[PDB]
RNA sequence: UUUCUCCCAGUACGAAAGGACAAGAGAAAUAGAGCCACC
C-alpha cells in the first residue's frame, strides 16, 4: 500500500537512483483512479532533486492469500517514452505483472530475478 | 495455430536483422519463450511489429484474445506480448545497450546485473 | 587416407577462415611470425580444422605444430 | 436488514443477481453466490431473478415446481454447476 | 596463461556448433557475439580469473548453450 | 493422535451440519491430496500449480509461522528469506491448485506464532530453499526448537515485551532491561489467567472428531 | 451508479491521409444496500 509519503527504495541502476542521496525518495501520489498504490501501479518519484516516473513492484502492506508479502517497498524507474530508465533490476520482482492490465513487458524483460 | 516456429519464420520473412529467442525451463515460473528482435529503423520496427500481429490474428488464436501493441510511440523499443511468446523489438544499437539477451541467457550471471548499486537514505535528524 | 587430400583440405580449412590474411598460405606457412597470429587466432584456426576431420585434436600438442604441414602430419599419424 | 438500534436497520432489502452454484437435495440446501442481508438463522425469501436478461429462465426448469412425488427420475443428492469444481476431483493444474 | 589451453580450444568450437544448432536466434549475430566475447575477455586474464571464465563456459557448453534456444 | 486444527469448529450459532458436510468434503480432498502433519516452526515445501505459468508447478520453502482458519478454508503461512528479502506466503490447505505438500523439516518452535521472527535477526529466518528433508520419527513428538532469537532495535511491529503476548522465544534480557519489562508488565491483567469466561472446552468435540476422521480413511 | 480499455475493426467510410458506429467482453472508480470464508 504505497499511500502518501511512504519512503521507498529505488531498485534500479539509473544514475539518479543509483547515486546515494541524503534525502529518501518519496511518493505522495499514484497514477490511478484510487489514491493507494500497489504492485504494478505507476508513480512519480522525486530522486536527486528531479522527478521521474516509477513502477511499483513490491509493498509492505499485507497481501491476499497465495501471494508473498514483501518487507520493503521496491520501485522501478520508467522514462517518459515508456522505456525503463534503468537497464537492469536487482530485487526479485513478482511475475504477476505480466497478467496485470497495462504495459509491463518492457519492465519484466529488464527484471533479472523473478519470484 | 500461431506458435514460435511460425513467428520466427515470419520475422525472417520481413528481414529481422537480429532475433534472439530464449526458452524457459519448467522450473523457472515465467513465459516459455522470450524473444528479442532488432530492426534497422523505426519505420522497419513499425512494419515488422504490425506484420506479426496481423499474422497472429489471422492464424487461428480464436481462444486467445487480440493482442495490443506496446511501445509503438517509442522509436527504439517496441514489444508485443503474445500468448506463449514475448517479442521485444528494438534498433541494433539499442540491442547492445540493453543486452536483453544476456539477461535471459545468463539468468544470474549477466554482467549488467552487477552494475546495479545500493544507496543510503538516512533521516535529516 | 590420402596425404595429398589432407594437405589440400588442411589448406582449404585454413583458407576458409576470413580473419587471417592468406598473403602467403604455403604448406610451410608459420603462424606466430609468418602470419602474425595471436593466441586466439591459433585457438580458432585449429577448431576449423577439427570440424572438417571430426576433432579429437587436443591443444597440448596442437599449438606446438605452428604450421599446416605439421598438423597434416599429426592428422596423418593419428588416423 | 439487521437492526443497529437508535443512532436503524430492521428493514426489508433485496439483493439481485445472485447465482446458484449447488443444491443439496438431502438437506434441501441451496448455495447462492454473494452475501444475503440479515443475521444468521434468519428466514429469507427466494424467488426467480427479475432482471431483464433472465426474463425467461423457467422454460428449462420445473414449470410449476419440482415434484418429488412424481419421481420420474431420482435426482442426485448434491447438484453441481458445470464450472464448480467438485470435492474429491483431481487437483487443478493451470495447463 | 590458461591452466589448460585445451579447454579454451574445445570451448570455442563447441560454441560454434551450438550456433549452427540454434534455430530461433539469428545465427549471424550469435557467431559475431561469441567472437567478440572471446576477444574482449580472453586476451588478458589471471590464472584464477581465467579458470572461472573457462569453467563457467564449460557449464555454458554442457547446458544446452545455457538456455539459448 | 494428531487432530488438525481446521477440523475443530469455532464456537458460534452456525449449524453443526455445515461442519459435518465440510469435514466430509475435506476428508475426500485429503484422499486426493495428502496433508502431512506439521506445526508452527516446521519448515515445509509446498507444490502448487502456477496460474501465470502453463503446466509448470511452484515449490516454496519456508518455516511455518502461523496457522489460521477452520474447515475447508483453513490456511497456513510459511516464512523464508529469498535473495535477502523476507517473504511470507499463505497457502490454503484444500485449494485444488496445491499439487503437493512436503514437510521438509518437521519441528516445533517455542511460541505458537512466529511473527516476532520479523523483528529477529535474519539468520533465524533464513532457510535454504533447496535443503533436503531431514529424518523424522513418526511415533514421536515433533522436535521442539528452544533456541531464543535475538531482536533488532527496540522499534518493533508489536510490543512482544507485553505479558499478553507472552513470547517465550525472545531474548528480551539482551535488548530490554528488567525495569522495561516491569513497564510492559503493567498490562499484566492477572485475572485473565484465572478468567473462565474466555475458556472454550473442545475435549469432547476433539475426541468425537478423531473417530469420524479415521472412519472416512 | 459512473468512467476507462478491448472487441466489433485499419473494417464502414475515404483518391489517399485518415478513421466510425450500434452490439458484445474485460477492467476499474464511486454511490447505495449488505456481508465476515479469508485478511
Curated annotation (Swiss-Prot), chain A:
GO cellular component: mitochondrial inner membrane; mitochondrial large ribosomal subunit; mitochondrion
Subcellular location: Mitochondrion
GO BP term, example: mitochondrial translation
Molecular functions (GO terms): structural constituent of ribosome
UniProt keyword list: Mitochondrion, Ribonucleoprotein, Ribosomal protein, Transit peptide
Similarity comment: Belongs to the universal ribosomal protein uL14 family.
Subunit structure and binding partners: Component of the mitochondrial ribosome large subunit (39S) which comprises a 16S rRNA and about 50 distinct proteins. Interacts with MALSU1.
Summary of the function given for this chain in its UniProt record: May form part of 2 intersubunit bridges in the assembled ribosome. Upon binding to MALSU1, intersubunit bridge formation is blocked, preventing ribosome formation and repressing translation.
Protein name: Large ribosomal subunit protein uL14m
Source organism (scientific name): Mus musculus
Curated annotation (Swiss-Prot), chain B:
Domain of life assignment: Eukaryota
GO annotations of cellular component type: cytosol; mitochondrial matrix; mitochondrion
Example GO molecular function: mitochondrial large ribosomal subunit binding
Major location category of this protein: mitochondrion
UniProt keyword list: Mitochondrion, Ribosome biogenesis
One GO-annotated biological process of the protein: negative regulation of mitochondrial translation
Record's signal peptide: none
Subcellular localization, as worded in the UniProt entry: Mitochondrion matrix
Residues that span the membrane, as ranges: none
Binding partners and assembly: Associates with the mitochondrial ribosome large subunit (39S) via interaction with MRPL12 and/or MRPL14. The interaction generates steric hindrance that is expected to prevent premature association of the 28S and 39S ribosomal subunits. Identified in a complex composed of MALSU1, MIEF1 upstream open reading frame protein and NDUFAB1; within the trimeric complex, MIEF1 upstream open reading frame protein functions as a bridging scaffold that interacts with MALSU1 on one side, and with NDUFAB1 on the other side. Interacts with MRPL12 and MRPL14.
Protein family: Belongs to the Iojap/RsfS family.
Protein name in UniProt: Mitochondrial assembly of ribosomal large subunit protein 1
Organism in which the protein naturally occurs: Mus musculus
Gene behind this protein: Malsu1
Boundaries of the shown chain within the full protein: 85 to 209 of 228
From Swiss-Prot, chain D:
Subcellular locations according to the entry: Mitochondrion
Top-rank lineage group of the source organism: Eukaryota
Family recorded in the similarity comment: Belongs to the universal ribosomal protein uL3 family.
Assembly with partners or alone: Component of the mitochondrial ribosome large subunit (39S) which comprises a 16S rRNA and about 50 distinct proteins.
Protein name in the entry: Large ribosomal subunit protein uL3m
Source species of the chain: Mus musculus (Mouse)
Gene behind this protein: Mrpl3
UniProtKB/Swiss-Prot annotation, chain F:
Lineage: superkingdom: Eukaryota
Record GO biological process: mitochondrial translation
In-chain residues carrying the UniProt-annotated modification Phosphoserine: 4
Amino-acid biosynthesis listed as a keyword: no
An example molecular function term from Gene Ontology annotations: structural constituent of ribosome
GO cellular component, one term: mitochondrion
Entry keywords, A to Z: Mitochondrion, Phosphoprotein, Ribonucleoprotein, Ribosomal protein, Transit peptide
Subcellular location(s) of the protein: Mitochondrion
Assembly and interaction partners: Component of the mitochondrial ribosome large subunit (39S) which comprises a 16S rRNA and about 50 distinct proteins.
Homology family: Belongs to the bacterial ribosomal protein bL19 family.
This protein's name: Large ribosomal subunit protein bL19m
